[PDB]
């Protein structure tokens, strides 16, 4: 009986195996645009994905991860609210069964069709594993997806999903450029949070971009053809793999823009 997104193992059940689920800095959260305050202390955000090297794409039974080679300083995120350099290790999405839901973070309670998460770990901790034992071990860049025009840079990902339909399946996925998934503006909101799936560790500095990217209905529809189940098991479509907004508690969301 492992955790999942169903009625009997979903978000409302996670706290039993992972008590931190009711912690003080859980994610995602609703972003109240009117309460968010511009922060002058924020330095310019730097997203350097030019030397990014993807290696494989994997269906882990919860979502699909496009993994990168992080053995060297290539794709790095720095600046903004970040202290030091954070290295890109993988990215994935959260999406819904319908266009009206799917994102984890919400803006003034508005839910987007999906949300892209680019995961990075603080290089001063040596590795990914050590980083998740630190309050500032990770930095996740979140990008909302709305349904409209297709996102050309996403098609490569969409087309390989047929080869990793079920849990446990992986496929080579080299030379994918994550720069093709970024919106024009880097305006963002930031706050201290956690991983949004078990183990829900509170080691994340969240940077959520204000401008969403547009993806086509056809592209998101293919996301919904993936399976939560493994090969040879009853089919359960991989949809609504998002955690709802959690209590903001003692936190303030800062804006990078006036
Ligand atoms: C694989 C992992 C569990 C899942 C974690 C996880 C879960 C959801 C997730 O999605 S979201 N929305 O970005 O939060 C991202 C990650 C990235 C980190 C990853 C951990 C990376 C890691 O070193 N360890 C080992 C570990 C755990 C605790 C202390 N030291 C090392 C994990 O078990
Ligand atoms: Cl179900
Ligand atoms: Zn995520």
From Swiss-Prot:
Changing residue 63 to S: 2-fold decrease in enzyme efficiency, as determined by kcat/KM ratio, and efficiently inhibited by chlorzolamide. Keywords: Acetylation, Cell membrane, Cytoplasm, Disease variant, Lyase, Membrane, Metal-binding, Osteopetrosis, Phosphoprotein, Zinc. The active site is at 62 (proton donor/acceptor). Optimum pH is 6-8. Substrate binds at residues 196-197. Changing residue 60 to V: Reduced activity. The keyword Lyase applies. The modification Phosphoserine is found at residues 163, 170. Its EC number is 4.2.1.1, 4.2.1.69. It is an enzyme of class 4 (lyase). The record marks 90 as: Involved in the binding of some activators, including histamine and L-histidine. Its cofactor is Zn(2+); Co(2+). Residues 1-257 form the Alpha-carbonic anhydrase domain. Zinc. Can also use cobalt(II) with lower efficiency, but not copper(II), nickel(II) and manganese(II). Changing residue 104 to A/Q: Strongly reduced CO(2) hydrase activity. Activated by X-ray, histamine, L-adrenaline, L- and D-phenylalanine, L- and D-histidine, L-His-OMe and beta-Ala-His (carnosine). PANTHER family: CARBONIC ANHYDRASE, CARBONIC ANHYDRASE 2. Belongs to the alpha-carbonic anhydrase family. Catalyzes the reversible hydration of carbon dioxide. Can also hydrate cyanamide to urea. Stimulates the chloride-bicarbonate exchange activity of SLC26A6. Essential for bone resorption and osteoclast differentiation. Involved in the regulation of fluid secretion into the anterior chamber of the eye. Contributes to intracellular pH regulation in the duodenal upper villous epithelium during proton-coupled peptide absorption. Interacts with SLC4A4. Interaction with SLC4A7 regulates SLC4A7 transporter activity. Interacts with SLC26A6 isoform 4 (via C-terminus cytoplasmic domain). It is linked to Osteopetrosis, autosomal recessive 3: A rare genetic disease characterized by abnormally dense bone, due to defective resorption of immature bone. Osteopetrosis occurs in two forms: a severe autosomal recessive form occurring in utero, infancy, or childhood, and a benign autosomal dominant form occurring in adolescence or adulthood. Recessive osteopetrosis commonly manifests in early infancy with macrocephaly, feeding difficulties, evolving blindness and deafness, bone marrow failure, severe anemia, and hepatosplenomegaly. Target of drugs used in treatments against glaucoma disorder and breast cancer. This is Carbonic anhydrase 2. The gene is CA2.
């Amino acid at each position: 009986h492992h955790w999942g997104y169903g009625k009997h193992n979903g978000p409302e059940h996670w706290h039993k195996d992972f008590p931190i689920a009711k912690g003080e800095r859980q994610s995602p959260v609703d972003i109240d645009t009117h309460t968010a305050k511009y922060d002058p202390s924020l330095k310019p955000l730097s997203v350097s994905y030019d030397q990014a090297t993807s290696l494989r794409i994997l269906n882990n039974g919860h979502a699909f991860n496009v993994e990168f080679d992080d053995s060297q300083d290539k794709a790095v995120l720095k600046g903004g609210p970040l202290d030091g350099t954070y290295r890109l290790i993988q990215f994935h999405f959260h999406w819904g069964s319908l266009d009206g839901q799917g994102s984890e973070h919400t803006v003034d309670k508005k839910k987007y069709a999906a949300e892209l998460h680019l995961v990075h770990w603080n290089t001063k901790y040596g590795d990914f594993g050590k980083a998740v034992q630190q309050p500032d071990g990770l930095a996740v860049l979140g990008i909302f997806l709305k349904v409209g025009s297709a996102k050309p840079g996403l098609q490569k990902v969409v087309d390989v999903l047929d080869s990793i339909k079920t849990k446990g399946k992986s496929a080579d996925f080299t030379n994918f450029d994550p720069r093709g998934l970024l919106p024009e503006s880097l305006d963002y909101w930031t706050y201290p949070g956690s991983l949004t799936t078990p183990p829900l560790l509170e080691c994340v500095t969240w940077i959520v971009l204000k401008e969403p990217i547009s993806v086509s209905s056809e592209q998101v529809l293919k996301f919904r053809k993936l399976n939560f189940n493994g090969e040879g098991e009853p089919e359960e479509l991989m949809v609504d793999n998002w955690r709802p907004a959690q209590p903001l508690k003692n936190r303030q969301i800062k804006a990078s823009f006036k």
